[PDB]
Amino acid sequence: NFDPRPVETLNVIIPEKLDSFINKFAEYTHEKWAFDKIQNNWSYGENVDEELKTHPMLRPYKTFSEKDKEIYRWPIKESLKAMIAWEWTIEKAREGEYDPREGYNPQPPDLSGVTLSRELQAMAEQLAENYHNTWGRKKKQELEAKGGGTHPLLVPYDTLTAKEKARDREKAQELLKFLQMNGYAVTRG
DSSP string, 131-172: HHHHHHHHHHHHHHHTT----TT-S-GGGS-HHHHHHHHHHH
Residue 111 falls inside a structural domain: no
CA 78 to centroid of chain Cα atoms: 9
Alpha helices in the chain (DSSP H): 19-39, 70-85, 118-145, 162-181
Count of structural domains, the chain: 1
CA 29 to centroid of chain Cα atoms: 7
In terms of residue numbers, what domain contains 127? 1-93+119-189
Q: Kindly report the CATH number assigned to the domain that includes residue 32.
A: 1.10.490.160
> Among 161, 111, 115, 159, which Cα is nearest to 133's?
159
Q: By three-state DSSP, how is residue 44 classified?
A: coil
The dihedral region occupied by 47, where left means phi > 0, alpha psi between -120 and 50, and beta the remainder, is beta
How many C-beta atoms surround the C-beta of residue 91 within 10 A?
10
Residue 98 falls inside a structural domain: no
Residue 110 falls inside a structural domain: no
Handedness of CA 23, 25, 27, 29 (dihedral sign): negative
- Let me know: does 5 contact 138? Beta carbons within 8 Å: no
Residue 83 falls inside a structural domain: yes
Q: By three-state DSSP, how is residue 74 classified?
A: helix
Cβ density class 5-40: b for 16+ within 10 Å, e for less = ebeebeeeebeeebeebbeebbbbbbbbbbbebbee
The dihedral region occupied by 83, where left means phi > 0, alpha psi between -120 and 50, and beta the remainder, is alpha
Residue 104 falls inside a structural domain: no
DSSP 43: B
Amino acid letter, residue 56: P
Residue 37 falls inside a structural domain: yes
Residue 113 falls inside a structural domain: no
Residue 106 falls inside a structural domain: no
